[PDB]
Symmetry: C4
Subunit: 388 residues, 4 copies
């Protein structure tokens, strides 16, 4: 087969339809379902699969105790069939680590996992299910990457890494891989002041990443990558529709080239589709915590610092817990346009539900429709009392 | 490969032989078997599989409590190997929703799932395991479809939808899909007064659907579809051998173009094979509840309002619980005729068995034989006391 | 590919080596392992698999209670990978019934399952995983077949059926199938007086079956089938080395054309390889019950009514429970000869171990070696006390 | 496809990166994970898999009691996907026995399992998942082999066997197989005085095996095999960096042609990569017991009896239990050199942790990097108290 080429634009987004949902915590109440977090979705040319970081234990297992913690030797990037739960028996390990990304270039899949202590972490780059390249920490402070899928064009797969402080200036790099080999890396340029957990998608040979400013910003940084020239720029989403969490209330003027102030040293992985009048932003409904999720249609959100929503769709009720969210698309689907998709991590357990001693999640996933479809709300659906 | 063409007639039906049985509730007593309902069977060119709507929980799981309810965000159309039970580890999710149909056109499979609140539901049409088209509710009252397999001819797959009241005039539409794309839809025509949960099969390029009148009728509506012209007609089975449930006792004159009165606002999904002198009708044995199941040979049942049985076969004893039933055939089998097949849903739990708090089912399935085979009876076989 | 042709002779048998063992009862103590009995082994051109009749429940499941009973609606022929246990999640259902046979003809597999009440049973013949032909009971008294693999030559697969009394003259038929279709059947001829549960193998275009006389004989009946002419003969193993169970002690003169007397109305499925000086007989060690298993080299056992052993190999200690045993070979292996193989069913539970309320088994399997290998003994290995 | 040819040299080893980890004991606390020991890793041309000897029971199963014992009829060589745990439902049995080796020659896999009583054991050689050759015990004292992967060149796969005393002179043989057939065997020659559990790898058509002297030596014997000439030599690692366990403290002069004294009648399976200045040795950190694991870069360790480490990497902390370790490589990976890999068995349970009555293990695996990567430590990670 051939390397995928990013030759299409986004389909017109008029609403979102249900794509996938695994009900993992519900099923895991009485099945051998692995404890996970930081999930995402990624497509092969012939299959789409759920991905996540396992904690090396099942939910009902006693080793689920303490799984609020993010980094350990027992974590691994796993994948499993669309909308099935991540079970011990159906999960495929991609690589070992506690921070990851993965994407198919059209011929084979590249997966990257970072492991190690906070001051000595390293990334291993897998291609065609074999280790090919390794990257040592350059700032010795939790080398970390996207936690959702990367995107490839003509064999070149850009990946965003950060190494350094989570609460101040850090060392962000953009690596360009081909068949797992490092073609090039570059230090972050542009006006984005802090970069974490980028969510990316590709269309008419450009790759757009929406990231998390964990330092001073509650507006989201954007990295725009040219995979042919292997260069990039960065800024913030200009819109006063703020989409980090926690965050201040929406003002009437946003910030294009600096963090919007109000909330320090926190954030959540999120995403957006920036496409002129076809622009949709995702965010938690609550400004205080990771609960609820909504999509908002905000024309020219990227460049217009006065832009407001003209349409929306609730995905998860404010009464229900959400979590990380990110973008993916089926680049191998039929048609003349790419259908925008996304997932929302539905975190259950600690810290918000501390009657149990574990932290896990389930997945809900949506794709865009050209129809104006009716909306439902999609909770995790598990009852904590059952786990007591 | 090629689109299947409906070029054969039905094989002569002289009896029925066992085809499949999954014993799901028996096995689920101590295995991770998903709670389901509304099952069916559908064939690929190289495999036949069981299908059903999962409830997003196992039987022994505590989330099985309350699964009598038909619609929730935790349901999904799943498929699994013939005669195996629907387990967490062997079930493949086709799409997310609480009403479905699915069929293979010879090249790829189309699956349709409806999800949403009762007043804002939508259908998503999957083809080759990718979402392709979406249909919003047109009557804002539980958009719903067949709950058994559709049938394709030369790539065109007709599907019957209903939106609107379950106890009065509703808005029924027949959609015609090809590779998941909508070619055409039409409002229901003919003399059928209410349409639910159609069971369909195809033979010498015609498709026949036997449905459920949930309004005033205890005779079954029939929709006859021309997949080439993409048109249809409708009436009722003329025979006084009534096959809905609940139902009045069999009279000596049936009704061809209007509901046979006696039982309002109820019914059950059922099926028939209408083939002149080779006509067989399925029905519950009880006239009051979903218990027992029998096949009855009723010559020209479709057109003769005096027709009575001349042969029969008991499938499930009246002492045992049945449920939904529907038609399917292996359109890719060897031979010069299509072998008529059907399944019977064996519902266990609520409402009839309320010592448990769940509702699930197992599956039994039969195919026709040209031999006059001896009959057995095929119960679910689980003992409720074991679940207490 | 092509139909297999029986062009090779048996390899010289100088000892037996371990081939497969699933430890099903051991593992089933704390895993979802299906209750089975009547197991066997059969090879595809690219894989060899274990086969058995499931009871539609796991061992730890409460529905395991009462599984001593042979016939029910919840039984099915299942297959699963060599030496793995028969689990809910890895078992493939071949067909539904309580008596079976199965074999690959080189192109596709034929499987036959019999189901029904004792007075109205029927066989369904599956080919390429589709139902093709059906056979109704002809004597209305538990239609039953081999319970081990059949053998094919040039597409023709002979199968031995019995219908009628288990304790007197019955109606035995030999059917000849091709691609699941009935070419021919014939009533049993020759001097065998009663036929049950034939174990068969093929070599230089002839098929040899060793069966069970359940009426008056403790010597085993033999059916020799010509799959080209589609004819057969029958007699008994002439050797005074008696191999049924229960049985009298070995005399010095056997019987070629009549039952050897001593034990009425009982027996066990067994096998032999009849090959002149390369002849090996299998039997339980105990003359009273299904315990122990040994192979004995008995030159010209088939034709010499004075023949005694000159070599042997213990497979299962007399202290351990055995059960049914049968023949199979990998007809698609490399080399100029067929390697003789066999399995022994290791029955655990009732009636011999009635502290538990279930009956199940595990499998041990051996193949011949041209070496004179050391012998071990191969028990089931489960401790009943663990199940209490 | 073609036979693999050993045409490449080793990649430069500057550090080790995480390759695989299954967390089997952690997951097995509440999942159907098989009890194992003596694990290893071996690659097919299209997949790499974990291997081990099952004990025919799960960890939580009551039959786990007593699994400290090495040899029984319930053991089997199993394989399962990389970094998944060995479960009842995902494990593939290669052959039956309690001592094994396995390797892919480029076309098909050869697996060898030894079974039997201590005085009558036999090896069965499987090729392309079929039994092909058998070897009877020649010294009648626990015939045993490598317990890690063999290596093939141009279809010829050498395997090291030992039969005889574990505490004195034994009968070691090197067998040369092709497609499972015995080409040749030879008695051990050279200056190695005792040989057990060889760990092998291949590079520029030579095969190097690092073994265990269980008699008088705490330095490791090395067998160097020419797979073309089908001949071999043997000696000890000359370096005073002793790598058996238990062992004396490191002296300043090692021994090339005789055991280094201090510890009798014990040892552990281990490995090394002997490659001039690119030489790395593995060993337990403790000199007294199987705890901890480290890699040490020891230039010309094989030939220089004064050689000391100049670099190292800790794999497992001394505080954590280790066990057997061995070599493997992906001979089918891209690039101009073979990437050195190894696994470490992480033994949990008895004898060191006798609060539980079982003995099992998990696996950690590393591969070499040309980068100087930061190091982590990789414990099994299970808490014994959870199993009480
Ligand atoms: C069946 O399903 C269908 C399909 O899903 C359902 O229909 C959907 O219904 C939902 C809910 O109502 C809609 O979502 C909302 O959309 C509005 C935007 O639409 C309105 O505004 C448009 C823009 O108007 C402005 O510009 C135009 C210029 O052209 C001008 O004409 C106009 O006067 C005004 O100047 C209008 O165009 C639009 O009209 C159109 O659509 C109507 C249908 O909705 C139709 O009737 C009309 O004829 C016309 O066609 C419409 O008036 C979003 O504003 C809204 O999002 C806000 O509100 C939700 C709460 O509901 C909140 O969570 C959001 O975050 C957001 O509110 C926050 O952000 C604002 C921006 O900063 C801020 O100003 C707010 O104060 C608020 O801020 C606070 O909360 C946030 C969040 O916690 C916090 O961060 C802040 O700090 C602060 O605390 C919804 O997304 C769908 O659009 C609609 N879809 C369709 C296809 O119709 C249908 O209801 C279902 N049926 C049933 C029976 O259930
Ligand atoms: C081994 O297995 C074999 C194979 O399975 C077993 O053989 C099978 O046995 C079963 C059970 O007996 C049979 O099923 C029944 O079939 C009859 C129909 O067959 C009879 O009627 C035929 C038609 O006769 C009429 O027309 C001809 C014109 O040509 C005329 O000659 C005749 O005088 C009459 O006018 C006859 O042709 C037929 O004879 C043939 O077959 C005989 C074998 O059966 C053979 O001996 C003959 O020589 C000849 O070859 C035979 O007489 C069905 O009527 C019947 O279905 C009714 O009864 C069951 C209860 O058993 C019920 O559940 C059904 O719903 C139905 O009854 C309801 O509906 C009627 C129509 O509305 C109504 O009139 C009834 O009052 C009743 O209504 C009530 O109940 C329903 C249900 O709850 C409710 O909804 C209503 O409101 C109301 O309350 C059976 O299906 C198989 O046909 C037969 N198969 C074969 C191949 O033989 C064999 O028994 C097994 N062996 C052993 C040892 O077990
Ligand atoms: C490592 O592993 C190896 C390989 O497995 C082990 O070696 C094996 O050891 C076993 C056990 O000893 C052997 O099995 C037995 O074989 C004998 C047959 O071999 C003997 O007889 C041969 C025939 O001799 C006759 O004919 C020749 C004519 O040529 C004539 O010369 C001779 O005088 C006599 O007339 C001999 O050729 C043979 O010698 C050869 O082999 C020797 C090694 O064994 C070797 O030393 C010699 O040099 C020569 O090479 C040998 O003498 C079987 O008879 C026997 O089977 C009977 O006994 C067992 C009990 O052990 C029983 O279960 C069987 O059912 C059977 O006994 C019943 O049936 C008889 C026939 O009806 C009847 O007469 C008996 O009374 C008895 O009947 C009772 O019990 C049954 C069962 O319950 C019941 O139904 C009846 O009603 C009644 O109650 C064994 O199968 C293997 O052959 C041997 N293999 C090899 C390759 O060596 C080795 O031991 C292991 N090492 C260690 C350390 O453990
Ligand atoms: C982030 O990760 C990185 C990457 O992993 C971490 O960096 C790693 O750090 C570890 C730990 O320090 C290092 O492992 C040790 O390596 C040393 C060898 O390196 C030293 O020695 C080299 C050789 O020097 C000699 O020769 C040269 C001739 O050229 C001569 O110049 C010199 O004077 C001397 O004569 C030096 O070249 C080397 O310097 C280089 O590297 C430095 C970085 O380390 C750098 O700063 C320099 O500039 C230069 O580039 C360095 O000095 C091993 O010796 C050591 O292994 C011993 O010690 C461990 C305990 O730590 C023990 O377990 C080992 O078994 C071994 O000690 C036993 O064996 C000896 C030999 O028999 C014996 O003499 C000992 O007494 C001891 O014996 C006892 O214990 C054993 C075991 O129980 C028992 O069997 C005996 O009987 C007895 O009881 C370590 O392996 C890595 O090399 C290093 N990697 C890299 C790439 O830097 C970094 O730390 C991490 N960062 C953070 C913040 O955590
Ligand atoms: C989890 O571990 C903590 C110790 O850190 C303990 O206090 C708590 O009881 C544990 N919870 C359970 C459910 O075992
Ligand atoms: C099921 O839920 C109901 C609450 O709606 C509760 O009363 C009942 O006890 C529950 N049953 C079980 C078995 O937990
Ligand atoms: C099995 O069923 C019988 C009733 O036939 C009952 O007496 C016995 O206690 C049951 N055994 C178990 C273990 O439930
Ligand atoms: C394991 O078996 C021994 C008998 O050898 C027994 O004493 C011990 O209690 C058993 N342990 C468990 C946990 O059953
Ligand atoms: Ca922030
Ligand atoms: Ca009705
Ligand atoms: Ca008998
Ligand atoms: Ca030693």
């Amino acid at each position: 087969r051939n390397f995928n080429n990013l030759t299409k634009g986004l389909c017109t987004i008029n609403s979102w339809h249900i794509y996938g949902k695994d009900n993992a915590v519900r099923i895991g109440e009485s099945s051998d379902v692995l404890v996970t977090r930081e999930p995402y979705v990624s497509c092969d040319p012939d299959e789409c699969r759920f991905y996540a970081l396992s904690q090396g234990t099942t939910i009902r297992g006693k080793h689920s105790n303490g799984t609020i913690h993010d980094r350990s030797q027992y974590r691994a990037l796993i994948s499993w069939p669309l909308s099935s739960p991540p079970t011990v028996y159906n999960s495929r390990v991609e690589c070992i680590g506690w921070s990851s990304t993965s994407c198919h270039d059209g011929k084979s899949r590249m997966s990257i996992c970072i492991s190690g202590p906070n001051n000595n972490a390293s990334a291993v780059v897998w291609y065609n299910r074999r280790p090919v390249a390794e990257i040592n920490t350059w700032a010795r402070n939790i080398l970390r990457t996207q936690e959702s899928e990367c995107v490839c064009h003509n064999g070149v797969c850009p990946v965003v890494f950060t190494d350094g402080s989570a609460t101040g200036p850090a060392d962000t790099r953009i690596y360009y891989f081909k068949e797992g080999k490092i073609l090039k890396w570059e230090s972050l340029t542009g006006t984005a002041k802090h970069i974490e957990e980028c969510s990316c998608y590709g269309e008419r040979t450009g790759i757009t990443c929406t990231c998390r400013d964990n330092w001073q910003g509650s507006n989201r940084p954007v990295i725009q990558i040219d995979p042919v020239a292997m260069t990039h720029t960065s800024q913030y989403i200009c819109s006063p529709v703020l989409t980090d969490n926690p965050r201040p209330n929406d003002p009437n003027i946003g910030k294009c080239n600096d963090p919007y102030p109000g909330n320090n040293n926190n954030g959540v992985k999120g995403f957006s589709y920036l496409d002129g009048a076809n622009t949709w932003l995702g965010r938690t409904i609550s400004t205080a915590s990771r609960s609820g999720y909504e999509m908002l249609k905000v024309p020219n959100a990227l460049t217009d610092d006065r832009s407001k929503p003209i349409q929306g769709q609730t995905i998860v009720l404010n009464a229900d817990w959400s979590g990380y969210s990110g973008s993916f698309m089926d680049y191998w689907a039929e048609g003349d346009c790419y259908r925008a998709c996304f997932y929302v991590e539905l975190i259950r357990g600690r810290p918000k539900e501390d009657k149990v001693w574990w932290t896990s999640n389930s997945i809900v996933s949506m794709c865009s429709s050209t129809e104006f479809l009716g909306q439902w709300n999609w909770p995790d659906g598990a009852k904590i009392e059952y786990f007591l």
